[PDB]
């Protein structure tokens, strides 16, 4: 094995033993470096009832280097690109090996209801979030419904 692979097995064991509310994930069948994950939208937010699928991509440099994470489900959120790529500060400059898959996934769930206003990846979503909360929620509701497909 390798340190990344042993760490990933530890991350999985910890996540499966004590999963945070509305989050789960596991390595793919055939490749511990690629995981499938699910995040349920947080209760009381525009994303409630959404069941969102994600892919997490690691390397042999984990946990020195953060993974990348993308939504496979359709998304509408200021910090998610059109291709599903998720922008999260802890996956960039605020990375620490103290974070693991569990805490990455919980951060992404929390991100859903707490957009980062700094240079958002989806300008349309950012502008609606800022200036037309009412309409932001309709656009979010459409991708909540699609997430059940
Ligand atoms: Cl962030």
Curated annotation (Swiss-Prot):
Keywords: ATP-binding, Cell membrane, DNA damage, DNA repair, Membrane, Nucleotide-binding, Nucleus, Transferase, Ubl conjugation pathway
Catalytic activity, reaction form: S-ubiquitinyl-[E1 ubiquitin-activating enzyme]-L-cysteine + [E2 ubiquitin-conjugating enzyme]-L-cysteine = [E1 ubiquitin-activating enzyme]-L-cysteine + S-ubiquitinyl-[E2 ubiquitin-conjugating enzyme]-L-cysteine
Pathway: Protein modification; protein ubiquitination
InterPro entries noted in UniProt: Ub_conjugating_enzyme (IPR050113), UBQ-conjugat_E2_core (IPR000608), UBQ-conjugating_AS (IPR023313), UBQ-conjugating_enzyme/RWD (IPR016135)
Domain UBC core: 3-149
GO molecular function: ATP binding; ubiquitin conjugating enzyme activity; ubiquitin protein ligase binding; ubiquitin-protein transferase activity
Domain of life: Eukaryota
Record-annotated active site: 87 (glycyl thioester intermediate)
PROSITE patterns for this protein: UBC_1, UBC_2
Pfam families per UniProt: UQ_con
Localization per Swiss-Prot or TrEMBL: Cell membrane; Nucleus
EC number, UniProt record: 2.3.2.23
GO (cellular component) term, any one: nucleoplasm
Primary role: E2 ubiquitin-conjugating enzyme that accepts ubiquitin from the ubiquitin-activating enzyme E1 and transfers it to a E3 ubiquitin-protein ligase. In vitro catalyzes 'Lys-11'-, as well as 'Lys-48'- and 'Lys-63'-linked polyubiquitination. Together with the E3 enzyme BRE1 (RNF20 and/or RNF40), plays a role in transcription regulation by catalyzing the monoubiquitination of histone H2B at 'Lys-120' to form H2BK120ub1.
Subunit structure: Interacts with RAD18, UBR2 and WAC.
Family designation: Belongs to the ubiquitin-conjugating enzyme family.
Protein name, entry field: Ubiquitin-conjugating enzyme E2 B
